[model samples]
Target: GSHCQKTSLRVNFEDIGWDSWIIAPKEYEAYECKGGCFFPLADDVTPTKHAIVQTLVHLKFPTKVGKACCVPTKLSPISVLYKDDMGVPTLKYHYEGMSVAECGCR
Candidate 1:
């Protein structure tokens, strides 16, 4: 297995020209996911079952539910998990923006 294979993390340029902000889309070289599968996220070790279910909307699924995801090296210890007032164990981790830090990018 190669660590430098293609992944799904997208990079784009943002333009502040004119009165409105613009998105400068850039094309990237595509690579086939090895093992005869396209599961780029298979190595992600940080996504929780609740989080995975949350992503089904993008796949046209009407549900919320998966196993834990691969948490990138830099993103380890993903969040500060705790219990709620209702005595439910919770790990509050979610995505809102496209902020990319120096996680596992190849």
Candidate 2:
């Protein structure tokens, strides 16, 4: 029953009291990776060689190696317009790893 997929995540600066500094893009959709990585991983899951081996090992020796985990296989960036410490407007072109693009077993 375990499957990995993308989930919606709404990020609002104002929600976390960050609007005072972040002035633009009041909210954004920051997708998230959620689910479990179980046996017989699908091709779309993009299982790595290590993950395959690790999963096999864990299947045989449950107490030895932990099961493969579902995590973000690819991440993307986010831009923001915010104020600096000196109250100067700043435009951040890339906030790396701010959103998840894909998911896989690891």
Candidate 3:
């Protein structure tokens, strides 16, 4: 059975050398980081410098019509617990409702 699990992720900005909470592209100020890059993009060639600014949780970028790049500060880890049809603990992965015997199980 699919185990009820919620994704909880913590990003270490300081560990990644992120002095600033925001990073905007020079070519497009309209586009910003909605989420932190889990893995450094291969095509990223911009020079990052520390900006003096304090951002709050879910801070809106451009402060009006623009979106934010990454989440502000450290946010509570995303905890999503899944429930089975019977609403009990399950240890299956993906497609909990489906039965393998129907498709060809021993």
Candidate 4:
């Protein structure tokens, strides 16, 4: 379905960054209870699941139910994210995401 316009995390391929597919999608069993063990289904899981969801949100995802209507969004984080913006992405990290008044970009 053309219900989603998905974009992957970008990597430059011109100077050997990223371009071209290396692998294709495959389905796994992802078995559920089908077991008698009483342990939680995901005991060792770090739950970084949010990271994928965040990335998908930035890149957009197909609706979970029914026919989906796609909406395009600009995934740019911020101008300062690019060095050419005369700002360094690290400047935003100096405050540990709290923003500092002394930052050059600020």
Candidate 5:
């Protein structure tokens, strides 16, 4: 069954680093169905650093538009307690990691 799980996640930005960023999500209503939902794409493939900061300068790279890149950050598995379809608490390994350390922007 498909369902919408409104969850708020907290990250330790200070531990790694942080600042403002252009976070992009295609759809505002993020939903998890029996199929899948938003998740990291890969663990090794990534875009070049120049591609990440191509449009930061004003008219410096007029030909370039800010592009989105997926850089995989190593994550640790942690047990996530969530109620199943039957409403029973269940344990699941949730990968925990996000990258905001690239580019001078964030």
Candidate 6:
């Protein structure tokens, strides 16, 4: 089925040279949104008001407006322990779109 779902992704701090500062957890599971937002969206898909309208419009005019995209509906936070400029280990919580919790059309 062409439905939006959560996909696993490994975020490696060392790949981006962030391991130098990050004290622990060299890699973490950073889930991502995958799959397509086909017509007749499922109930659990949770389509937004604008997405509903856009999907309807796209049905008639495919080129007029792009089809509703499968994206993250809810996000989660990630805590990281990194060294600050003063070389002190600091624990920080990132809460703004750090990981995908739910998938929906929008």
Q: Among these predicted structures, which one has the highest lDDT?
A: 2
Candidate 4 stretches greater than 4 Å from native: 13-71, 76-90, 94-106
For candidate 5, write residues 9-99 as lDDT tens digits: 4543333332112122211221111211112212223334553354244235545644333332233344345456776656555424332
lDDT of 4 at 14: 35
Per-residue lDDT of candidate 3, residues 3-106 (tens digit): 11122334443455542331311121111123232222222312122211212212444454332233222222222233457765444333232111111000
TM-score per prediction, in order, is 0.21, 0.81, 0.17, 0.18, 0.30, 0.84
The TM-score of candidate 3 is: 0.17
- Stronger candidate by lDDT (1 vs 5): 1
Residue pairs whose backbone atoms clash in candidate 2:
none
Number of backbone-clashing residue pairs for each candidate, in the order shown: 9, 0, 6, 3, 0, 0
For 2-102, candidate 4 gives per-residue lDDT tens digits of 11223233233333422232111112111121111111213222223443344345445435422212222222221112232433322222212211111
Q: Which of the two candidates, 4 or 5, achieves a greater lDDT against the reference?
A: 5
lDDT of 6 by residue, 5-87 (tens): 88998899899898998887788887988888877688877988998898888889997788989998888888889889999
Leading candidate by TM-score: 6
- Score candidate 6 by lDDT: 0.85
lDDT of residue 16 for candidate 4: 47
Off by over 4 Å in 5: 1-59, 62-64, 67-76, 95-106
Lowest summed lDDT window (length 10), candidate 3: 97-106
- Candidate 6 residue pairs in clash (backbone atoms < 3 Å): none
Q: Which residue pairs overlap in candidate 4's backbone? A: 12-17, 12-18, 13-18
The lowest-lDDT stretch of 10 consecutive residues in candidate 2 is 35-44
Report the Cα lDDT for residue 24, model 2.
88
In model 1, the runs with Cα more than 4 Å from the true position are: 1-40, 61-106
Residue 28 error, candidate 1, Å? 26
